[PDB]
Amino acid sequence: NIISTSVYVGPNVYASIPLIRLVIDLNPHYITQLASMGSEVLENLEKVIPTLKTEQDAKLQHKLEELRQAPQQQIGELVAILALHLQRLAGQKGGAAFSAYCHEDETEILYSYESEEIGIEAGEVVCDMLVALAKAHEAGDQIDLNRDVKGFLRYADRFALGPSALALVQAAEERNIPWYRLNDASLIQVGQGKYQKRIEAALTSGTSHIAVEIAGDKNVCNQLLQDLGLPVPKQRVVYDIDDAVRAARRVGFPVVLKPLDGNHGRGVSVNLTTDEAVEAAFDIAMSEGSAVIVESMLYGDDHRLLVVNGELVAAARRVPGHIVGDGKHNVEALIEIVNQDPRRGVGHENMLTKIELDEQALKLLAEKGYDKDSIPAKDEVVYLRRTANISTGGTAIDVTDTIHPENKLMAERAIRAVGLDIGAVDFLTTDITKSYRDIGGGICEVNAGPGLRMHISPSEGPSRDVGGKIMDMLFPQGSQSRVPIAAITGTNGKTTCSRMLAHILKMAGHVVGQTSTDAVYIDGNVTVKGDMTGPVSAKMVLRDPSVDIAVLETARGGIVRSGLGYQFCDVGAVLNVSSDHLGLGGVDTLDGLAEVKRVIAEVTKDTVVLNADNAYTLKMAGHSPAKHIMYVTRDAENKLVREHIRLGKRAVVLEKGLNGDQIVIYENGTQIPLIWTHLIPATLEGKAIHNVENAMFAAGMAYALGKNLDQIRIGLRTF
Amino acid sequence: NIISTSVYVGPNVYASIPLIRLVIDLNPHYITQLASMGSEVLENLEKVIPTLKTEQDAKLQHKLEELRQAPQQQIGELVAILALHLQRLAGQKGGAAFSAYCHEDETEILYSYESEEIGIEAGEVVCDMLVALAKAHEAGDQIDLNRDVKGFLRYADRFALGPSALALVQAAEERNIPWYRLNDASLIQVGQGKYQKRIEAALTSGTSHIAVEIAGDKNVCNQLLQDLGLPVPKQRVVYDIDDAVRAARRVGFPVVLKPLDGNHGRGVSVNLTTDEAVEAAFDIAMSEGSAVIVESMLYGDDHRLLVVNGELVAAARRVPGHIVGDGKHNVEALIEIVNQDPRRGVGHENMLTKIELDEQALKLLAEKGYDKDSIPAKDEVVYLRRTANISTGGTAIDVTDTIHPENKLMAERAIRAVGLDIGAVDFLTTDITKSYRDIGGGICEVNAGPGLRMHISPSEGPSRDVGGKIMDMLFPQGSQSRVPIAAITGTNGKTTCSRMLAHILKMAGHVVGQTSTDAVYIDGNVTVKGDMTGPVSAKMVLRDPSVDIAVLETARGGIVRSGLGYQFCDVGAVLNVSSDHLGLGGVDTLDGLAEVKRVIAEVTKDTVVLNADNAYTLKMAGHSPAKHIMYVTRDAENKLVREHIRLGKRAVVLEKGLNGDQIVIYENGTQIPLIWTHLIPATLEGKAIHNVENAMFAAGMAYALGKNLDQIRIGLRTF
Ligand SMILES: Nc1ncnc2c1ncn2[C@@H]1O[C@H](COP(=O)(O)OP(=O)(O)OP(=O)(O)O)[C@@H](O)[C@H]1O
Numbered sequence A, B: 001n002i003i004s005t006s007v008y009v010g011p012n013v014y015a016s017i018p019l020i021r022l023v024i025d026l027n028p029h030y031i032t033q034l035a036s037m038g039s040e041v042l043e044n045l046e047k048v049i050p051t052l053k054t055e056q057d058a059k060l061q062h063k064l065e066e067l068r069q070a071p072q073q074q075i076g077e078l079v080a081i082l083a084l085h086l087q088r089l090a091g092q093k094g095g096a097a098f099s100a101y102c103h104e105d106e107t108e109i110l111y112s113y114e115s116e117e118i119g120i121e122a123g124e125v126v127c128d129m130l131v132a133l134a135k136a137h138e139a140g141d142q143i144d145l146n147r148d149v150k151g152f153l154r155y156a157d158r159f160a161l162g163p164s165a166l167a168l169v170q171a172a173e174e175r176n177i178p179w180y181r182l183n184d185a186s187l188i189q190v191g192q193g194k195y196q197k198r199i200e201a202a203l204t205s206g207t208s209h210i211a212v213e214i215a216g217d218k219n220v221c222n223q224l225l226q227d228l229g230l231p232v233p234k235q236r237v238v239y240d241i242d243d244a245v246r247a248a249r250r251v252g253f254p255v256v257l258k259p260l261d262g263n264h265g266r267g268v269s270v271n272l273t274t275d276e277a278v279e280a281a282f283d284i285a286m287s288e289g290s291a292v293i294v295e296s297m298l299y300g301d302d303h304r305l306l307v308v309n310g311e312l313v314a315a316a317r318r319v320p321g322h323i324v325g326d327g328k329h330n331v332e333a334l335i336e337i338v339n340q341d342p343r344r345g346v347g348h349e350n351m352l353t354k355i356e357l358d359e360q361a362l363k364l365l366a367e368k369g370y371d372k373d374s375i376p377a378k379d380e381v382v383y384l385r386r387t388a389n390i391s392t393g394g395t396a397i398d399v400t401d402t403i404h405p406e407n408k409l410m411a412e413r414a415i416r417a418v419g420l421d422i423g424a425v426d427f428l429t430t431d432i433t434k435s436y437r438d439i440g441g442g443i444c445e446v447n448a449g450p451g452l453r454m455h456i457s458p459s460e461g462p463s464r465d466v467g468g469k470i471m472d473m474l475f476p477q478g479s480q481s482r483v484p485i486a487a488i489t490g491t492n493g494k495t496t497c498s499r500m501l502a503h504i505l506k507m508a509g510h511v512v513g514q515t516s517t518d519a520v521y522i523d524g525n526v527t528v529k530g531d532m533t534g535p536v537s538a539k540m541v542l543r544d545p546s547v548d549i550a551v552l553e554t555a556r557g558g559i560v561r562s563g564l565g566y567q568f569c570d571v572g573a574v575l576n577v578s579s580d581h582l583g584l585g586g587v588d589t590l591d592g593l594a595e596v597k598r599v600i601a602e603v604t605k606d607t608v609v610l611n612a613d614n615a616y617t618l619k620m621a622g623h624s625p626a627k628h629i630m631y632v633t634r635d636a637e638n639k640l641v642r643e644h645i646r647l648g649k650r651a652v653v654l655e656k657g658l659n660g661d662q663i664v665i666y667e668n669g670t671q672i673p674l675i676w677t678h679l680i681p682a683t684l685e686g687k688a689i690h691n692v693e694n695a696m697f698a699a700g701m702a703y704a705l706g707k708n709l710d711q712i713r714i715g716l717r718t719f
């Protein structure tokens, strides 16, 4: 039903938001189609996309669809209402949607959603559901619409960060810091230039290539681990199968044949104690033809000790699925019983696997002497899995709190020898609460950068905030700057005010960047110039690993089409944007332009500097979250000084006196003269209009950014 | 000829050194075989292993083989003389060799060589050359012996660090810091625990896994590079060949088909401007079936800008081999002429390739209209290579000094966006001295971690110390500790003196490690115990990334078999080692034991603490490089106080007085009482002998390591 698309990357319309433009082909629309579309249009939506429920918490700012059924669907608005909930079904985040009806026979839906990759399409599924339902033979809910829904969800998953990365994303958001998808797939960037880090789940910018390659190199790790005195099996001396038999003789006959390379499943042979057992196993386990290492067998369960900043933050005991007898039920009946655990299944909530008597389970129960219908002795255990897994597993039943301090220390040491920040040592033991002295080669692998899917939200015991523990050593409370100060002016004197502010901040000693449609400027030089519509100039400054302050300087053309390239700022300014000429088209008087200028004022949180001589800019003070206002006036006689400063607010006032033409910053109970117009090259020799307000605004911006007077006067005089 | 082997890892015999034990099967040895063995035995050695030359600089401490010919070869000694030179031929480093003749009919060769992997075997080749020559029909030099030599050299190369790593090794040695082969192959560790880094040529511990994976990911790099505003071709939008033709249409028809994945050679199609040209090229260039990316063609030569710590340290212009006409010679004749360049060939010195009119060259000369026998116009150029290479190339003719500052800046920015410390930006341009504004997409690849074989020792222009520039940002002069203080006592009170010293250093605030045959102790805990013969206890402490001071504590059994696990120390000590019991066997009086104790005294460079009551330990002062001596005496009446301290030397003297039994450290012009024996638990309540000298020695060691008196008294009292 969709004809055209656009996206606001910034808050042109309150927050970043995609726009869907649709046309009604179904001229005899919902208002004249209620025979085949009664209450069931809503009931059908509840089943086709089962997030579209009568849930009071489902972004229900306005409870409208339940009052409309078919006669008043107002499909353009209904698509906006139903849009985003499909994305919630896919595990995506988003907000409200609104004001979809526009021109006759057309819709422009504004709906708030975090990702562009599946943007619009979610509304495609929704608008087609509503029209397709009308265009159907009273066919019910999941006519064919459930196909489109599942397809969408798969795509939404395709472009999603995995759960191990989402753990860090949520942890970043909860510490109030921004992030980006940086490398596609699961890698994100947290923070902005100068302070930012590229991180991917259990992988950080602090961990080197060498440490990771070492971690992958099992032969190297075993030697490095031995060099620490760790409790390791060592014995990595056998390549392939050493022509058979000899390979076990060299490490001791009771061996395990560990699969290597790409063997996905576990082509592992176990408990082989004779020449025949190993000779047969060697060419079975090495099913890849060249992917086996021969090690002696040690006994213990499968533990994982996840260490981040030295500290053990999580642990797991990846016990393979099994059954324990209750004294009455047989092996097969127990499987049916195990599968009644409400946490098992597929989709959301169901994080555990199911047990079936498949070939792996069958070989194991056969090894134990079972034909499936017999009854295990009470408390007898038969394993139906060889080890771990997430989809065929999901077991995670360990603790970090009862583990003997020395086992924790040996795991830390293993990680340090490699040089990793994050890893979960693969540790085998019969008793994790005893020291390593009784654990026969418990450390087997360093396991660098484990999926957190195996630690977060465990099957037993308390959970641990693995996401937060990782973020704590990346963006600690000990370092408060994660972002540059956002200090952005409006669609104004981007070629003069901007120079004065950049000079102030550079002379102050900050690295400052801006792009006044010209090549992007970082400190003393530039790169790319162009149609700086918003997101380009912003990422070119914000992601540049040098910048302390982001000024950017916006433009009206960019904003009306894309919004801002950033979502909010701390500091900003609005100077007059109207003149008797073309602005944005439309009205270009007070109106039209009022909407573009408010984009900066309403997103500024601390100090917005407003032009006090513009009666139609003054109104921004009634909307902006910023409270200082810093009214700037070229008229010493005004009301917004005495009825403003006197009440604790700020202003920049041009006045004449002992200091010639001077610009004075007023604040609460005092006032301090800063510059002469007579001394600023931008304003010639004084007695001039052009760039006087630009100098006043640069000073106002400087106030907000930490005026110390002396370096500001230098920056203002510099030009 | 070799029967048995052993190796000293430390200076049991002056420096670390392998030992070869050989037997003479050739009873009618060299002295009775001169008819078939005249001057030519030496002349033959000069040709079989052509490092065995009459070179005055060839470790020629003693010019002996030239005076011996056959009648006095003294083969056990001659093998020691000739050994190591084979290793020099392989590009290996080593020293002197000596004292090979031992028991009748047997040899024990001591020869100094850096690696164990090809140790002994080099002497195997040599001892067999000498015997095999005698056992031959006056057969000359390279009978079959040259086979064994070439085999050896190939093995020596197999276990060698590559030239790009050797660049860092030599740079590390020239800054006086130790290193180890850590990960086999080319990776080394420079420095010791607490200060050490794992580095591999153009790869350091400071560069993360994420930065390297990004560098390898060409699609990601092009987007990250575009986000900086770099002069890049971008256009990484085509997967495979996009079903043919369309792929070029999408980027512009004038395209280059760049090979991907494992394509070793250059399956690149160029200058394709039509539908037919690209359709044909697409299935030719993608010879792997799935390894092509389609990009538009940009013009320029192949430049590499190697950046390490921001700074451009080297550059190369990898101009493919070509010929330029001189107005007289044809293409084929010019090839013969080019190949007369003395730098071209194989082996040592010959670092450039040779030109042949092979298929690559032939296609290129055919494209230019040549049949090989025609004459190019003067200064006309025909390329006989598509690009670069080391073995089929070796061209490196750029500079770093004339490159326009902005091209250097764009290369730095490319490296930073990825997050690498080291890389050589792959930059295309027609003129590197002009800014990027005129270079049509010059940055193509980040090229992380390049072989230095393409930058070090260039074919034209000045060389640059790429090795040193890398070491400068790893082990800068701004950080002087690269190693722990080596503070090692002799085969003494390893269970008491050692505790007192460890307590002193821990109470002082240093992390100290030691292994008194017991489990290795690092700070407050331990791991592995065992036959601590030298190298194990040393690497267990020295490579442990926490330790500031390495005490170790040695033992006589370990030293007589392996030497020390370290090569030298700053501080050390010798207490009495003899008693009326078994020591090392042999003599066990003054002798036998004198040789094991001198191992510590003679490798101590600053302060060695000697026992002044032992007339047969005093003699160590005449051999040790250490000059303070710190004579320790339990007898207030001695001569080695008044004739020692008075002359500027140090001592620890036990004396009786106002402070009961006290231990006083004397130094040059003063003396300061430190402890009472009455207050040290090790010495009971005073009026005791056991551990008094151990306390005195711990205090002597503390002196050398920075006594501040107060934390030393605490460490001495602690026990
Ligand atoms: N000496 C040993 N004794 C007992 N079991 C061993 C021994 N060596 C290896 N194993 C088993 O082999 C398993 C290795 O499985 P594999 O490496 O294929 O799993 P994966 O899915 O690749 O994950 P990971 O590498 O983290 O184990 C260990 O988890 C352990 O159960």
Ligand SMILES: Nc1ncnc2c1ncn2[C@@H]1O[C@H](COP(=O)(O)OP(=O)(O)OP(=O)(O)O)[C@@H](O)[C@H]1O
Pocket: B233, B256, B258, B259, B264, B265, B266, B267, B268, B295, B296, B297, B298, B299, B302, B387, B426, B444, B445, B447
């Ligand atoms: N747009 C282009 N215009 C001209 N030549 C190009 C273009 N893109 C790639 N090339 C050529 O393709 C070459 C790439 O060769 P290839 O990547 O196979 O070499 P390599 O041996 O793997 O080393 P490297 O990756 O460092 O280039 C570049 O060196 C350059 O000569």
